[PDB]
Symmetry: C7
Subunit: 182 residues, 7 copies
């Protein structure tokens, strides 16, 4: 299991204002991040917070609780992508404090458009089709804001999977800097 | 994995009078909330309580145990929706203390009419069909009360799934204010 | 997991010091016996102070429920019952069995009473034995309700033939509970 | 998760010499009961022990390890049936200390003959068939001893499932007294 | 779940009293716990006897052999008491207790038989394993012969099929020394 | 069962700055290593770190989070292969601090080209085919760098599975020294 | 349930420098032994270590991580077979310190040649067929070294499963002495 230092390794790094977001985004792991963001704010609302991201994405609602909590709290939340940051992972990465969004040299980042599904009555399909296009609209606006791109460019570039290297992501505005050595 | 601070992260935020309702509403997670509400009432019946909600809904009986506990206890129960609050989740959100029901900019809220199912004898189907139509009326009455809407509007807007943004939810009365930055 | 409180109890152990016990979900031997143990412990801690049993249950095992019911009557303290969410089948009987005048629910709780359910397979001779046993259980359970609600025996039998849902007000008019609590 | 008032609730009642036997009887839960009986004997070989039984029965061998441990140790082991005590559950109840075998008003007790099954060679069936008829005789002898009934009555009444009320079980000898309110 | 004694679990509490429990089917992991408990007790006191309670239907021969050989290897005498049942490896481990200190309780059941196995593959490989299980059969019979005092050919014959035994029968056979009834 | 020393055995060896990477490479075990690497850097950024590897490989993104963290942090991260180090495992071994890459006499190391798969629209297949071809090139560049081999040799020798002994791995540059006795 | 002594039973025997290897050999249980061997060395690099073995075999790579760690460390690692030591289990037993490899009277030991399997391209089959023939050679060399037999005898005697008694294993060189009573 998770090794100990009585702290587990992650509790020990939480004192350093470090939070890890690992794996598929889902309601329960997302709320752990929220709780850590809220806890760290209370410990010190001025000191920066560092959110490490290695995720392929997941639930839009689950990510939005993370994204909105990052913006809502007083401390700046830096984001660093290690390994990969795809879909909601990439949106959370772009959502970090301005100038404090990083990745490492071989990180992979991918952005695409929302995925969903529904079945039932045509009237109900209409409701959910409109809800997913609105979610698509709103998520593109968040990207445009943090990257500086026009919404129409984000919508076009995310139509299909678009993978990005560290350098490409900086050119895009998805991150600020590729870190190499401390 | 629940991190530690010797409290775990949620026990640590429980002292600040913060309770989390995450995921599908069901008897056991619903009863934890009830117990947390009662404990906080005993710790201090005057200080407010803050209930964060990221839930797609679930059991009406489990949800009503939460709803009735929120009203029953002396302290005001504020509600903040992060991520999503759909079906029973939206009712618990609307049921928070007057003026102290919030959400974040990208929260999604959805209201609809109750869901159910049964199989057996026609005589038994009649009994259970009448019970769910009774719940449908009772739940619409609860929404009308907390939102200020006329009952016939609630019945109309909840016939099918109806999604709402933060701004829309404020105009509807479902919440009081969209929080953006602390 | 179940959250923690300092002077270090988990939330339910912390409310147990306040003599509050929770019965959640389907009634079965193991969760039912936990309730029994909590009832017995609280009796030894103080045989005079009331005990509060919160119920949110759809029912379950008749024998498992009966271990709870008989423990409630057996011990000296009065066991109040409050229905939150729902109290159906064995859940409703345990609710009805609370100390006289101290049986409550909350405004939107739902309560349901019906007749016992069972099943068996085997030889006709063996079916006969178990059919008689479940008919006996039905008689005694209706007698428990009649006693605690004040209703005539034949009325309970009549009303439990099919599922019968009740609101808080209905349950008070019926005798199933004493009072609908709203605000402390 | 068992609540904490620092003992877990059952450990706290274990100090009070109360042991709970719940659910299907099987080697592992049965051996816990055995362990609790031995520990309590070591803590105090004179004080009574109270064994609550809410069980539908189960393995005879696992139950017999409990039955024989109850008799072997010095303390008297009282038994109280709550909920139900059927098959091996009823035998463990009947096997409690004389005059100290109880139930509550709505407890249900059921006695019957043993159940089994086997497959293989006819010769092996014969061996195991003889083994279960021996267990059936031995178990009837255990009931007859503790209830006071004649052996042939036990054999007669256990041919099929036989349920008993509290009052009936007292009249039969399966238990001594139906408890209603504490003293 | 295992109750606590104050902070001991019930079994660790009885381990101080030099008691070890062997419950259920014999397999590598539960078998090694017993070995470790035996080794620990030898280190705590190499002279005091050890009490091994056995309620098992048997299991792996290799797993059982690690217990048997550890019982003989260590200096303390390993008393054995059967509660419930002791079948197959369970009965061998019981018979393997220190001479004069092998017990059971009145309603214990013991069963002895020949080893069970299975294999599939090439005829050459079947031959290798068929001879290995016949060697295991010979060796296990010799262990029974040693501890019971019976001749080897009698063990082979009596184990051809499942053979159930009562406490009295097991004493007559040499499988155990005495049927304990009351402390 | 993790044995105890008030440490579990791995927590005790973490103090001697030893980290174990065992089994298939995946986000969660990979991030544990990242956390241990960061923790050890903070305790002492100058003392070397010893990373034991017994792995057949696994997720490239998960491994790269380990790889990039090894280089990013201040301490030299020694690597010792015990048992096996194949695919991503062999890359992590070769990526250790120069001159401090070891194995034991019977360790097996294997290098090959990336594996992947996808299904869907031809246009989407095209996107991911180019992405895995990009990863293949970048990984060959990493091996070439740490082993000293020319890029075209790595491409040639990794076309199919290529197993190496300790001695072979030293001649190749994959490791620096075969340890025998301390 | 592992009983407790405040040590669990196995942690308590670890102080006496006893390690248990039970069941199928696999990466995770194998690395625990490695970790315990390294810890005992650090606690005292001169005092002997006692490794009890009751295993039917398992992974060659996982077993080799154990074997090489036994040789690498300074202390002598005695080995005692209780119950059985088959396949990799028998190799680890034979690999114990010279003169300090034991068994108990009814232990069974079995040696055979390695097993493997593969599917795919004929070219890939060729690569892996050569690798398992190489592993077969390397493992036979290990037994030859520790047993004193010529390699060709080991290869021949392991062509099929070969079971051994305590006395047989001693004449063969697989173990040094059959312990009976302390």
């Amino acid at each position: 299991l998770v090794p100990m230092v009585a702290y587990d390794i992650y509790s020990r790094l939480l004192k350093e204002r470090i939070i890890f977001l690992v794996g598929q985004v889902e309601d329960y792991m997302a709320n752990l991040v929220v709780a850590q963001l809220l806890f760290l704010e209370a410990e010190n609302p001025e000191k920066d917070i560092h959110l490490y991201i290695n995720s392929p994405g997941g639930s839009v609602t689950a990510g939005m609780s993370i994204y909105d909590t990052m913006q809502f709290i007083k401390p700046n939340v830096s984001t660093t992508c290690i390994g990969q940051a795809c879909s909601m992972g990439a949106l959370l990465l772009a959502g970090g404090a301005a100038g404090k969004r990083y990745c490492l040299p071989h990180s992979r980042m991918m952005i695409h458009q929302p995925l969903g599904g529904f079945q039932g009555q045509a009237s109900d399909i209409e409701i959910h089709a409109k809800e997913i296009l609105f979610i698509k609209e709103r998520l593109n606006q968040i990207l445009a804001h943090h990257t500086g791109q026009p919404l129409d460019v984000i919508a076009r570039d995310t139509d299909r999977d678009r993978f990005m290297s560290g350098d490409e992501a900086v050119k895009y505005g998805l991150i600020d800097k590729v870190m190499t050595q401390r």
